[PDB]
Amino acid sequence: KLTLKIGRAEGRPGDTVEIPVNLYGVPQKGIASGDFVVSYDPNVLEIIEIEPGELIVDPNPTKSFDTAVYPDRKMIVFLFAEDSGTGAYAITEDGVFATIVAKVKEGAPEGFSAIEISEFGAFADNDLVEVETDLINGGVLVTNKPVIEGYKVSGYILPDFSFDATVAPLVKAGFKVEIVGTELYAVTDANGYFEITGVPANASGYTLKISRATYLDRVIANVVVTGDTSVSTSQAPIMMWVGDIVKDNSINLLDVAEVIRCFNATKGSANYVEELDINRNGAINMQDIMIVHKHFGATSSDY
Amino acid sequence: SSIELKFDRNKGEVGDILIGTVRINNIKNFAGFQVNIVYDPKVLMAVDPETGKEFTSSTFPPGRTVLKNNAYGPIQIADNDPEKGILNFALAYSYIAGYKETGVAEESGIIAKIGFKILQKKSTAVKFQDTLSMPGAISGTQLFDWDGEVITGYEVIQPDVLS
Numbered sequence: 001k002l003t004l005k006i007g008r009a010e011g012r013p014g015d016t017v018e019i020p021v022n023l024y025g026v027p028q029k030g031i032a033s034g035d036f037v038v039s040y041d042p043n044v045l046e047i048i049e050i051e052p053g054e055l056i057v058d059p060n061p062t063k064s065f066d067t068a069v070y071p072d073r074k075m076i077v078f079l080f081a082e083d084s085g086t087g088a089y090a091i092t093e094d095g096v097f098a099t100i101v102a103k104v105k106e107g108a109p110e111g112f113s114a115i116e117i118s119e120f121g122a123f124a125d126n127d128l129v130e131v132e133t134d135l136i137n138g139g140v141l142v143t144n145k146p147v148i149e150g151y152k153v154s155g156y157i158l159p160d161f162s163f164d165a166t167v168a169p170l171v172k173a174g175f176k177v178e179i180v181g182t183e184l185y186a187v188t189d190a191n192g193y194f195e196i197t198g199v200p201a202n203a204s205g206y207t208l209k210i211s212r213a214t215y216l217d218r219v220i221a222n223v224v225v226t227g228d229t230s231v232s233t234s235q236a237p238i239m240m241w242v243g244d245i246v247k248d249n250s251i252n253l254l255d256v257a258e259v260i261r262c263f264n265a266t267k268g269s270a271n272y273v274e275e276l277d278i279n280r281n282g283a284i285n286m287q288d289i290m291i292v293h294k295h296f297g298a299t300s301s302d303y
Numbered sequence: 304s305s306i307e308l309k310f311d312r313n314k315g316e317v318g319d320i321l322i323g324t325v326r327i328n329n330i331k332n333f334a335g336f337q338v339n340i341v342y343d344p345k346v347l348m349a350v351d352p353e354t355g356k357e358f359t360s361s362t363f364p365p366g367r368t369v370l371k372n373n374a375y376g377p378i379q380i381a382d383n384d385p386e387k388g389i390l391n392f393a394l395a396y397s398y399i400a401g402y403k404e405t406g407v408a409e410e411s412g413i414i415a416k417i418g419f420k421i422l423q424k425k426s427t428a429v430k431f432q433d434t435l436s437m438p439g440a441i442s443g444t445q446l447f448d449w450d451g452e453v454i455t456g457y458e459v460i461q462p463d464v465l466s
């Protein structure tokens with residue numbers, strides 16, 4: 001059964017949206033003519049243009065298909081009449097009859113803004129016989145919720161040592177997680193959380209590189225992205241080992257030697273280097289060294 | 304569970320050397336330590352207990368009977384201020400995960416022997432004392448296990464006054 005459907009779109013104020021006008025159940029005899037009027041809310045939408053759809057087969061589509069946009073009347077007039085005079089440019093298949101290209105206005109109210117077939121004349125086939133037709137209204141869902149293409153890769157990271165609430169925000173924050181071979185990255189927040197959005201689909205798998213000054217780089221290979229991907233949870237975080245201070249991807253004596261150069265320094269003193277204060281308690285001492293020792297002799301592969 | 308400083312002799316003449324022995328007792332899974340020790344440098348001079356050679360800023364006390372297996376990479380650090388009567392030193396195994404795997408913890412032993420040469424026969428005290436660079440220490444002592452964690456819940460046994 002012949003049906004004319006105004007489609008749906010979703011946008012934020014300022015977005016350009018495309019609202020398809022579809023025809024279904026087109027008779028075997030084809031459709032040679034049609035006329036109808038759509039009403040819209042010009043508070044929400046500025047119509048930019050109406051593109052003839054794939055169903056419009058006139059090489060000069062404007063000769064068979066035209067619209068008249070009347071913003072003051074809140075109306076778009078659609079007129080179709082196969083221009084060949086012999087049935088050649090009659091609509092013969094179901095599909096997109098036209099595309100309404102509209103800009104959602106800069107300070108437009110939110111909510112669903114209906115686009116409705118407010119007046120309908122007739123669709124008639126090549127023999128001028130009127131075809132009985134169903135009407136379906138549509139519109140644009142205007143919200144302020146952002147939509148990102150591509151996927152979110154997220155997770156939790158935790159340093160492997162003991163610390164309390166006075167320093168948790170300092171030691172949990174600042175891990176860089178990089179998607180290797182891209183410019184995509186995230187930095188952990190005060191809770192050890194990171195998320196990278198807009199990550200392209202890749203079922204072959206990404207490698208993630210987790211890095212931070214004084215930490216042993218961690219590489220997580222084969223991260224498959226076919227959707228939003230969580231690589232770890234706050235209860236079972238990705239652990240990171242501190243002690244790669246002289247950066248050679250190994251925790252060894254040169255790393256400990258660097259802490260010793262600041263041995264017993266306290267926050268505010270000449271020789272205090274905040275990075276060497278492993279546990280950030282305000283003093284550089286054997287307690288910091290013993291944290292380094294937790295993973296002594298370790299290299300990135302040992303994770 | 305304790306750490307103690309104790310002297311072999313509590314009396315002496317100018318020029319004698321009193322041997323202060325730092326000892327740990329029943330310290331579970333012990334793998335390292337740091338201590339801060341204060342004395343009055345007008346009365347006592349920190350010296351090697353066997354040679355009488357005077358301590359400098361970098362002198363690490365000899366004589367420990369624990370953490371002596373070079374397989375686990377002991378690292379010793381001294382940061383004394385003899386002019387101000389302060390000894391501060393620390394030693395630990397670096398390969399604690401290897402020491403742990405062996406499964407035999409050295410929980411009692413000597414960690415330092417320190418001579419104090421008598422400069423004056425004046426009543427005087429030597430003691431573990433807290434210091435700014437060791438927050439959370441137990442009277443200027445920090446002991447560490449083979450997991451690299453601070454050990455708590457032990458007594459610090461100070462020596463009696465040296466009269």
Ligand SMILES: [Ca+2]
Nearest residue numbers: 244246248250
């Ligand atoms: Ca290193």
Ligand SMILES: [Ca+2]
Nearest residue numbers: 279281283288
């Ligand atoms: Ca510290």
Ligand SMILES: [Cl-]
Nearest residue numbers: 237238239240
């Ligand atoms: Cl892990």
